[model samples]
Target: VVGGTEAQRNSWPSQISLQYRSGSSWAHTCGGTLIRQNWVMTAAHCVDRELTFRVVVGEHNLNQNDGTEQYVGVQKIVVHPYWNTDDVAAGYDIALLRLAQSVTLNSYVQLGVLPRAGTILANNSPCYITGWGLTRTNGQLAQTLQQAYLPTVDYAICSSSSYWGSTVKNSMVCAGGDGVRSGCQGDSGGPLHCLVNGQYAVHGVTSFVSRLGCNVTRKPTVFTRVSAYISWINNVIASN
Candidate 1:
């Protein structure tokens, strides 16, 4: 993430590294949240490419081994039926991946509590975006996880002409329009944790950033509103 600080170890236990096989080694491609023991919530765009993918839970560093890490294979992936690769602005960018086996829960690995269905945060509500995405636009990925305080930007203001305009839909959440701190490349599919009723909940799945730049003025990072798909997620999990 742009203008972010290194996240404390085990601070965001549900945070995960979604990696793809590159040559002989695995490379971090995006971030995801562990929703269930064997299920992960991510952006549909992250799995658009047909490649071998694995998830590393409890990971704080990418280049170094974190003994607490739990590497799991992806057994099945279910992208929202309405998701359109050519039109991300249309807003069904979420996906769920079932793991080959269930991961054990611990201080460094746990399920992220999801927000209630249809829950919407108030304007400027406190929130944080965490990932190993990038420290700058067109920059290399951070070896360690990073987090930035990206307060919520309500739909009305975010959909304004000067802001994200029509690209910002109600099904999406916008944050960090200050243009200094924001989610960047490789941060997609990460979680947007919001403090609600004194508890942190996974309210968003990092989806996109401004086309002009990662941290552009009036163009905050956009995310798939997780609350909007609670029922869909439940159905997917139940049927799968």
Candidate 2:
């Protein structure tokens, strides 16, 4: 994320690195949330390329080794039927990946809690976006994980002509359009943790940023509103 600080270890146990095979080694491509022992919630666009995907839990730094890390192969992918890579602005940019085997959960790794169905955060709601995304536009990815405070931008403001306009939908959640800090490249499919009551929940799945720039004015990072697909999420898990 742009203008973010390194995240504390174990602070976001649900965050996982989604990697793809690049030549002889695997490279971190995006971020995801651990929703089950063997399931991950990510953006459909992240795996739309049909690349071989893997999941890394307890990964604090992509360059440095973390002894608690657990690597697992992807066994299956269930993408949202309405997802269209050519039209990410239309929403439904979510997907689920079933791991080859279940991974153990500890202080460094755990399942994410989803908010109640159809829950919407009010304007300026407290939230944080965490990932290994770039620190600046056109910059290199960070070796360690980073996080930035990105309060929720109500859909009314986000969908205005001065903002994302029709590009931002009600099915999506907008956060951090301050033009100083926001989700950049490699942050898609990551979790937007919003604090509700006393607990933090995975409220959004990182989807898109402005094509103009990662942290442009009036163009906050958009995400697939998780509460909008609670039944779909459960149905996929039940059938698969």
Candidate 3:
């Protein structure tokens, strides 16, 4: 569980979950960050499915509502043209979702900026990730918001043979401990945020794993670097 005061929870922008009904059960499709009045950033794989999805924002509880919950349908989904789920070298798993209607902006709900490239992320960088993802390997996803602190792994260490090695691209960043804490299943398309200035900036998007369990010390949790896709993000936002 994320250890913080109630004031902290009220201050932080809420993480949104995209849920869809599967037959008689409802399941989460992906995780997304509300980036604009009507724009959401997520993973391309989330948009590949054909279903009626809804976005639940500004809420910590899964069974009940604590914060304001706004439902918005997808107007359009633009996936990164170069994204390849099969190849980790492509490093383009990002996507943008245009909402059918604009959402009311509030203190607990706002846009996040993208960090600049060439910036070094250290082990003590004090970063956090939030999602409705599984709290444990092969376990059911948490109903309430779940958060975990992660240390950025050294690129040199992340690129070792035991890690991503040749598959680690410049557009990717890694974090998390072996099995201590991780963004496991159902965290796909979630944001990896780092505090910048007095605000939170999105640094990465939960992408994929080289292993099934989050028990590998060398294999770090890979994410799609938002800095590398700023141009594409800007283009989509402007045109939409």
Residue 208 shift from truth in candidate 1, angstroms: 0.3
For each candidate, give its TM-score against the true structure. 0.99, 0.99, 0.88
What lDDT does the true structure give each of the candidates?
A: 0.96, 0.94, 0.73
TM-score of candidate 1 versus the correct structure, residues matched by position:
0.99
- Candidate 2 residue-wise lDDT, 89-130, digit = tens: 899999999999999999999999999999999999999999
Ranked candidates, highest lDDT first: 1, 2, 3
* Steric collisions counted per model: 0, 0, 0
lDDT per residue, candidate 3, 142-230, as tens digits?
77777777666766777788777877777777877555666776777888888767777888888765565753566667778788888
Clashing residue pairs in candidate 3 (N, C-alpha, C atoms within 3 angstroms): none
Better of 1 and 2 by lDDT: 1
* CA displacement after TM-score superposition, residue 105 of candidate 1 (Å): 0.7
2 or 3, greater by lDDT = 2
| Candidate 1 vs 3: which has more lDDT | 1
- Candidate 1 backbone overlaps, count: 0
List residue ranges in candidate 3 displaced over 4 A. Answer: 1-8, 117-120
Give one digit per residue, the lDDT tens place, for model 1 in 124-213. Answer: 999999999988999989999999999999999999999988998999999897989999999999999999999999999999998789
The superposed Cα distance between candidate 2 and the true structure at residue 237, in angstroms, equals: 0.4
